[PDB]
């Protein structure tokens, strides 16, 4: 995998929510509608096929 580190920035999940690649947005532990109201230390993203 390609682990990408996300830090020191403002995360706008509404851009993802209004984006055209948007399907099966499943979440564990966090409600998907409240992700704009939280803070995280670092966010790690993994992209694969």
């Amino acid at each position: 995998w390609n682990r990408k580190r996300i830090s020191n920035c403002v995360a706008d999940y509404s851009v993802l929510y209004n984006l055209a690649p948007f399907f099966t947005f499943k979440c564990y532990g966090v409600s998907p509608t409240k992700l704009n109201d939280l803070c995280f230390t670092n966010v790690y993203a993994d992209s694969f096929v």
């Binding site: 929510y17 209004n18 055209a20 948007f22 509608t33």
Partner: protein
């Protein structure tokens, strides 16, 4: 409504159409039924009535 924003219309779910047109209350006892009707709603060179 287009199929991307059908899932937006829900109680406690935020969106563009879901917030700016009408919310669903949190005490909603009711059902939602959908159907993909491409035969009548979709028109040639866009349907600009809606």
């Amino acid at each position: 409504i287009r199929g991307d924003e059908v899932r937006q219309i829900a109680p406690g779910q935020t969106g563009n159409i879901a917030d700016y047109n009408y919310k669903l209350p949190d005490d909603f006892t009711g059902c939602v039924i959908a159907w993909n009707s491409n035969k009548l709603d979709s028109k040639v060179s866009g349907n600009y009535n809606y």
